């Protein structure tokens, strides 16, 4: 082709984009150089109107496939170069999933000694707090790893979040609905409702940190989730060992607290309510029996012969069921440490280093041009991906004979950079495009 005769060397490039996305108007000017022999592009685009209202990666597809390297056996399929020097018209409809669409029209021609790309872009129906207008896309053009822990953590913590909400709710119910008094006048906080509220609240904040940290891939929330679980786990084992090295030292302590509380029963309405509800519920009477009430047991005591003591019955219950609560203890512990391992693992597989995209080319007999369609996974700040659905049509501007090709594709690789000197909003881009899809000879 005579168009490839125009592309044997490195050709200066000029790119101009005037755009409008939901009324946000902007202009981009890019300059650079195009080496079609190696399929390399080096360009530096600058936003002439201030700051770009969209993420720079969304513009790189709209921002010259005539510099694609078609290997020698595929050269007779290079429509783009054949359309030169009189150029070709490239139209596109880029549909961002669950968001707006770019609508594009562009003319690519040789103007003087330079290959020029003039584009007007109009975007409609975008979310103002979406990934596009909210600048939530990473500044790159590769695919990112799927973090399945993102979903595992979010799933369990959502369930634990709801469990905690119900535990907190039942505690809120008991604080308002029922009155079981205060067993220890000095520890007013120690009520059955408050312990529900305390444990429920702690569960919700841990589950909240796990949910928000995992689904948004926020390292700081993951570390907070880890540190908080670590602290809860450390207190648990501390209490467990501290409990058994000093069981008898704190056995006395609560026994003093109960004996102190029982002196107040005929003078403190709250401690009376505590003893009355406890005894009538557990069907017990004193600390170790009915003799603790030296003037006679209150009415809310089983009148049976040797009713067991409330404190004795409780300690016997925990000693008799130590094996069960031990199983439940290590169960909550392993769930706890599993979440720690998950979070710590997920944290390490964030912010990593860094891919190819294929533009499938198909001929259009009737408009004497080509069509193309392809999907681009833009990487979102929360780890998810934003689909950009691309449909394309290219028609030659001139009446000269152009080449209509067999189906083939272009393996594009783009590298986004930043000029450390540019104080203006900008994008330094390196691309490598090579044609493929048609194999020659016998292999
Ligand atoms: C809502 C969908 C998720 C619901 C799931 C409910 C069942 C989860 C139970 C066990 C999963 C085992 C957890 C696997 C932990 C390792 C995952 C991992 O590290 O992989 C991440 C990355 O993809 C590199 O491998
Ligand atoms: C506040 C107490 C809960 C903190 C959050 C724990 C971390 C959740 C992650 C994995 C759970 C492991 C799966 C356990 C399966 C049993 C259901
Ligand atoms: C508790 O409430 C009663 C209501 O009968 C009230 O008369 C009294 O001031 C309080 N009783 C004691 C023992 O403090």
Swiss-Prot record:
Applied use: Green fluorescent protein has been engineered to produce a vast number of variously colored mutants, fusion proteins, and biosensors. Further generation of mutants led to more stable proteins (at 37 degrees Celsius for example) with brighter fluorescence and longer fluorescence lifetimes.
Result for mutant: residue 412 to H/W/F: Results in significantly red-shifted excitation and emission maxima
Organism ancestry: Eukaryota, Metazoa, Cnidaria, Hydrozoa, Hydroidolina
Keywords: Chromophore, Luminescence, Photoprotein
Effect of residue 75 to R: In Topaz; shifts the major emission and exitation peak up to 20 nm
Tissue/organ expression: Photocytes.
Keyword Phosphoprotein belongs to the record: no
Variant or mutagenesis effect after changing residue 433 to R: In Azurite; shifts the excitation and emission spectra to shorter wavelengths and increases quantum yields compared to BFP
Protein name: Green fluorescent protein
Quaternary structure, from the entry: Monomer.
Keyword Cytoplasm: no
Alphabetical GO biological process terms: bioluminescence; generation of precursor metabolites and energy
Effect ascribed to mutating residue 402 to A: In mut1.5; shifts fluorescence lifetime from 3.03 to 2.72 ns
Gene3D superfamilies tied to this protein: Green fluorescent protein
Effect of residue 431 to G: Suppresses the 399 nm excitation peak, leaving only the longer wavelength peak at 475 nm
Effect on the protein of changing residue 64 to N: In R10-3; matures to the red-emitting state with excitation and emission maxima at 555 and 585 nm, respectively
Family (UniProt): Belongs to the GFP family.
């Amino acid at each position: 082709s005579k168009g490839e005769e125009l592309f044997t060397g490195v050709v200066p490039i000029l790119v101009e984009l005037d755009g409008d996305v939901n009324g946000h108007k902007f202009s981009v000017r890019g300059e650079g150089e195009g080496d079609a022999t190696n399929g390399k592009l080096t360009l530096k685009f600058i936003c002439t109107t201030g700051k770009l209202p969209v993420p720079w990666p969304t513009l790189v597809t709209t921002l010259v496939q005539c510099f694609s390297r078609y290997p020698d056996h595929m050269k007779r399929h290079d429509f783009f170069k054949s359309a030169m020097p009189e150029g070709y018209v490239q139209e596109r409809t880029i549909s961002f999933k669950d968001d707006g669409t770019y609508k594009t029209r562009a003319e690519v021609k040789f103007e003087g000694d330079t290959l020029v790309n003039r584009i007007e872009l109009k975007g409609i129906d975008f979310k103002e707090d979406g990934n596009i207008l909210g600048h939530k896309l990473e500044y790159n053009m590769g695919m990112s790893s799927l973090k399945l822990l993102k979903y595992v953590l979010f799933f369990f913590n959502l369930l634990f979040w709801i469990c905690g909400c119900c535990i907190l709710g039942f505690g809120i119910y008991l604080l308002i609905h029922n009155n079981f008094g205060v067993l220890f006048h000095n520890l007013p906080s120690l009520t059955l409702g408050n312990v529900f509220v305390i444990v429920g609240s702690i569960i919700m904040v841990v589950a909240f940190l796990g949910c928000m940290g995992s689904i948004k891939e926020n390292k700081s929330l993951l570390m907070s989730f880890f540190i908080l679980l670590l602290i809860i786990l450390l207190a648990e084992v501390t209490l467990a060992i501290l409990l058994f090295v000093y069981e008898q030292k704190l056995n006395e302590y609560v026994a003093k607290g109960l004996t102190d509380s029982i002196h107040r029963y005929h003078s403190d309405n709250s401690t009376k309510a505590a003893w009355d509800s406890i005894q009538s519920f557990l069907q017990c009477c004193g600390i170790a029996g009915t003799s603790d009430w030296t003037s006679g047991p209150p009415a809310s005591c089983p009148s049976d012969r040797k009713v067991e003591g409330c404190y004795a019955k409780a300690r016997l219950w925990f000693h008799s069921n130590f094996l069960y609560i031990g199983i439940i203890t290590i169960c909550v512990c392993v769930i706890e440490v599993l979440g720690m391992s998950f979070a710590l693992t997920l944290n390490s597989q964030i912010d990593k280093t860094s891919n190819s995209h294929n533009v499938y080319i198909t001929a259009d007999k009737q408009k004497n041009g080509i069509k193309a369609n392809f999907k681009i996974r833009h990487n979102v700040e929360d780890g998810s991906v934003q689909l950009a659905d691309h449909y394309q049509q290219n028609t030659p501007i001139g009446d000269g004979p152009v080449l209509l090709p067999d189906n083939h594709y272009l393996s594009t690789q783009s590298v986004l950079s930043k000029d450390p000197n540019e104080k203006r909003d900008h994008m330094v881009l390196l691309e490598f495009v090579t044609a493929a899809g048609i194999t020659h000879h016998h292999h």
